[PDB]
Design a protein around this ligand. Sequence first.
Ligand SMILES: *[C@@H]1O[C@H](CO)[C@@H](O)[C@H](O)[C@H]1NC(C)=O
Ligand SMILES: *[C@@H]1O[C@H](CO)[C@@H](O)[C@H](O)[C@H]1NC(C)=O
Lengths: 216, 210, 49
Amino acid sequence: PSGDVVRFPNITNLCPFGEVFNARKKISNCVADYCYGVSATKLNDLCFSNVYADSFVVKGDDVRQIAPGLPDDFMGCVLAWNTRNKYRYLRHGKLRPFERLNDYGFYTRVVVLSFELLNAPATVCGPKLSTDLIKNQCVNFNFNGLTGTGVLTPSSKRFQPFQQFGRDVSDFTDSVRDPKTSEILDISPCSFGGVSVITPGTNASSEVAVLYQDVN
Amino acid sequence: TQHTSSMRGVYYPDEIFRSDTLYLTQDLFLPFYSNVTGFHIPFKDGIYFAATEKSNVVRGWVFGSTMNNKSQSVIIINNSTNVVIRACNFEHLREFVFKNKDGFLYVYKGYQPIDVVRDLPSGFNTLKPIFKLPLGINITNFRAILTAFSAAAYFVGYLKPTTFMLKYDENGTITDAVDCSQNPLAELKCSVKSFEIDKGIYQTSNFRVV
Amino acid sequence: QLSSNFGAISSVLNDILSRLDKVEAEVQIDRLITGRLQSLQTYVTQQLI
Ligand SMILES: *[C@@H]1O[C@H](CO)[C@@H](O)[C@H](O)[C@H]1NC(C)=O
Ligand SMILES: *[C@@H]1O[C@H](CO)[C@@H](O)[C@H](O)[C@H]1NC(C)=O
């Protein structure tokens, strides 16, 4: 590669990521600062859409009941904290995931964050200094959620207004929409191939020629 | 009045661009040539609601379990020019699709002129991902909200989990499709990934007597 | 067979390395490496025949 390219939504704002914890709520168009499918330390480099937080009050006696075994194919982040210094055990049938008698009787919370990614235009993610666009040179990609390597060039593909990525006939990403609404196709990882050495046999000389297989 | 829907009820499975390719996908679709109850209605996890009106005769939808001041319900209407949605204990061809999957209530839209007499028109079209809402309620039934004053008629279909073979044009839009569970021939098409097939004998999926 | 998962979280690299950074990613990558190594060996044998 030859350079680094980054493109992030230009929206900037301070995020209520802190207010909600200490006091289902949606968070969007913010810049959070800061697990079942993601690593906590890796959360500040990916851009999601409309992260949701589920909040309710339950004592530590019930924290060990919230986990798959919550959908089974879904991910999220769970925090908990106790300080001491209602529920239903009767219902005809259970409930499908993410849908909604006695009293615990507290005497002296659980946040289930949900991440949605690569569906709508990116609106929720942390600090990332942007960069200018470079074309026709093997570079690195750091688009909203596409880290790779290749060569960029303007595209001639008629994207629908509700689409933001591209796909080939084999499910490879040969196109993208810049967060500034531009269709540039990232064709091929610049160049690669094989190397073959032609020698007369080292019993008559030590001079060799080199062939590069598939290159302009 | 039971009518037949030839090839209506096709929508974009995802928000990805594709060209000159055939895509095999499994989801809740409306199988080609099914029954639509022409109304002049339990949700059952999916409803193909299409209406034909002359100058916006009627509009509205309600979703809930009991639908009478006992449990949560959802509303979709027009107040003056914008869509109004709320979730509390309440008191020439439209084409819509409603789906309730993991809390979120998805929606798709389409439009088309039609010149018909008293039933649904033929042909096919496509819808698009316009809305999706985290209502978070359990939906069992629904019922449209009419606008009393001209004849009006709205239809209802049912979505079931089937596999479709969608054809994409170089311009990037879905053009045709094949329902891989309607005919023995349709299964053959979805297996060799074509629309015309040479004569011969081709082996397809296995069968069991349940 | 490249667009086919083999029991891992995702079938595309840079989407396990993006959401994981350590042994957790090694356990997923080993599932993909094993699966892609078999389909490549099967291809070569059928070509020899
Ligand atoms: C929704 O409510 C109805 C009311 O009878 C119930 O039968 C159904 O099971 C509920 N939904 C689910 C997913 O259980
Ligand atoms: C594709 O689009 C072009 C112009 O946008 C149009 O002329 C053509 O009929 C469309 N369909 C094709 C080429 O199959």
